[PDB]
């Protein structure tokens, strides 16, 4: 068992908004939960885009999840990751 390296990135900056992508990589086994949350509440499926849970080529796997937010609301959003018992919550950089 290998825990993922979670990493949040900010992209597509315009009109006071940004796209925030939560990457989870280098993990095993394949099964994982990854979702953006606003105030600890999981976002709708139709407000997020998911990367497929696919192999690295080193025996481990990677996935991602992204959503659009407003600048000034970063503290309000978190990426929740759960994987083989353990779980964690990751902030948006500002």
């Amino acid at each position, epitope marked *: 068992t290998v825990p993922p390296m979670v990493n949040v990135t900010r992209s597509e900056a315009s009109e006071g908004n940004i796209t925030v992508t939560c990457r989870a990589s280098s993990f095993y086994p394949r099964n994982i939960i990854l979702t953006w949350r606003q105030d600890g509440v999981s976002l709708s499926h139709d407000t997020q*885009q*998911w*990367g*497929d849970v*696919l192999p*690295d*080529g*080193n025996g481990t796997y990677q996935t*991602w999840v992204a959503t659009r937010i407003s600048r000034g609301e970063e503290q309000r959003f978190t990426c929740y990751m759960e994987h083989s018992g353990n779980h964690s919550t990751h902030p948006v950089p500002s």
Partner: antibody, heavy 121, light 113 residues
Framework: GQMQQSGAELVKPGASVKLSCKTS????????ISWLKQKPGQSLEWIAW????????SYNQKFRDKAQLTVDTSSRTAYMQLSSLTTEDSAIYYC???????????????WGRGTLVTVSA | DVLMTQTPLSLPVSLGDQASISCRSS???????????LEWYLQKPGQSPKLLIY???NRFSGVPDRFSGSGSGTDFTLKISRVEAEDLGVYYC?????????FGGGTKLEIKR
């Protein structure tokens, strides 16, 4: 972006050749680079992919001893080394990328123009 | 291996007519992550293959809505609702679900004029 493949190669039987796929206009490290084989007037085969971010790879077992994929992050360029060439290795060889973040689960979303390899004495 | 059989091998169709191509796999192609990586490509003459459809039914960016993909189990179909002249070329189905990944034999679309 762009995916510039090297010009056609003539190579002797038993020799090897290193094909290149020089790229630009996109985040190279966030892409699976696959290599595919097409003999003119026939269908295609998948050889292997390499994820540029990790250098990790998956190989079609048919091309296990044939092909060796590598990636140079600095130059944003992918390489396939083919070795012990026979006449049956004469084909068009394509590099294609899986835009993992832009269109996830689409394996050959953008292609190079192809390098024609002719194996002959 | 997953064998991929297409029908027909050649497909004459009149301009503005509906064309459809079948792709039959020898076994199921649901990846263990529960996606079905069936993809359709069009190779125009003198060009490399171009992506039309991924994961069974998802139209790739730039691809006109006249192109449509569907199916499940071992039975998959690409449909073109109003065939324009630029649609001619060879169509390939592909599975990226089970290693080794495998292409269909190809379906040659010709404009019947």
């Amino acid at each position: 972006g762009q995916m510039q493949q090297s010009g056609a190669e003539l190579v002797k039987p038993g020799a090897s050749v290193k094909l290149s796929c020089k790229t630009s206009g996109f985040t190279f490290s966030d892409n699976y680079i696959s290599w595919l084989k097409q003999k003119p007037g026939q269908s295609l085969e998948w050889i292997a992919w390499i994820y540029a971010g990790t250098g990790g790879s998956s190989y079609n077992q048919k091309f296990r001893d044939k092909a060796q994929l590598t990636v140079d992050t600095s130059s944003r360029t992918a390489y396939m080394q083919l070795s012990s060439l026979t006449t049956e290795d004469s084909a068009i060889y394509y590099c294609a990328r899986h835009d993992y973040y832009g269109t996830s689960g689409a394996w050959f979303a953008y292609w190079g123009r192809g390098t024609l390899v002719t194996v002959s004495a | 291996d997953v064998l991929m059989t297409q029908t027909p091998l050649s497909l004459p169709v009149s301009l503005g007519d509906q064309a459809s191509i079948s792709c039959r796999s020898s076994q199921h192609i649901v990846h263990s992550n529960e996606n079905t990586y069936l993809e359709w490509y069009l190779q125009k003459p003198g060009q490399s293959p171009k992506l039309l459809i991924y994961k069974v039914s998802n139209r790739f960016s730039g691809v006109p809505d006249r192109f449509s993909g569907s199916g499940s189990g071992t039975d998959f179909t690409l449909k073109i609702s109003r065939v324009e002249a630029e649609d001619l070329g060879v169509y390939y189905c592909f599975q990226g679900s089970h290693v080794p990944w495998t292409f269909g034999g190809g379906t040659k679309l010709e404009i019947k004029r």
